[PDB]
Amino acid sequence: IVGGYTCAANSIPYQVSLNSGSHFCGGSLINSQWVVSAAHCYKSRIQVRLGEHNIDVLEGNEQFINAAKIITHPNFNGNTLDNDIMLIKLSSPATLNSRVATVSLPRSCAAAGTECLISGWGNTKSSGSSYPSLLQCLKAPVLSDSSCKSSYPGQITGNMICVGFLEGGKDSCQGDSGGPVVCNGQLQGIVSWGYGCAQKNKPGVYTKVCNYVNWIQQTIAAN
């Protein structure tokens, strides 16, 4: 996360780390046995790290659970990045409460201006490279489809929303993918893509989670 701050330990109970040997993506626990992430973060074997804070030190509060099933959206487009969503089923239910908690699905889509929280262990530098051991947080508002589409002419589908600041300086970055964008206690976005990081007029584009509640419920309730 670029231009953000270190979150208080275990302040984001729903944030999970995706591991295949090292941290490659993020995610959010929607229910004790399912995790939501991005489709481009797909891998055949993935371990979900719950209750994490400092991904480099065994602190004692973490839960290491392996994925039992991995489901990417049927219509994921590797080129346009449309439908960048993926569901991972844990092989064992996560032991919930306090440091490990689920995030609520959207009851309504978020409107432009709504303030959200974006968290992750991604790059903190918009220019150079720097990866935090500690979880970073960022408060950013949902932009309007207008600004988003002007920022990326011909590249914004109805399944994407720009969250960020057109003046740059703050944004998500490499390592944050699959991560959570939570506004008013509901999960509204998944860190997807963007031209660079924290660049001016190039906000971050996220998978619009409200366009998939029905699909998510059905998939979970049938797997």
Partner: protein, 58 residues
């Protein structure tokens, strides 16, 4: 070596932190980098062995 061994490295526009190897045409050796998971180029191999085979001479 195929033409793609001379393409510069490209992480892409996605924000994933995926370890992959590319042939550094400057240092003339395969190296490690981080692919975002989408829209890169052919100078992107899943293992260092593969890379050394195609671009170095294995």
């Amino acid at each position: 070596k195929p033409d793609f061994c001379f393409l510069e490295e490209d992480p892409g526009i996605c924000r994933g932190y995926i370890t992959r190897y590319f042939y550094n045409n400057q240092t003339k050796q395969c190296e490690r980098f981080k692919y975002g998971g989408c829209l890169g180029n052919m100078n992107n191999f899943e293992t260092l062995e593969e890379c050394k085979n195609i671009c170095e001479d294995g």
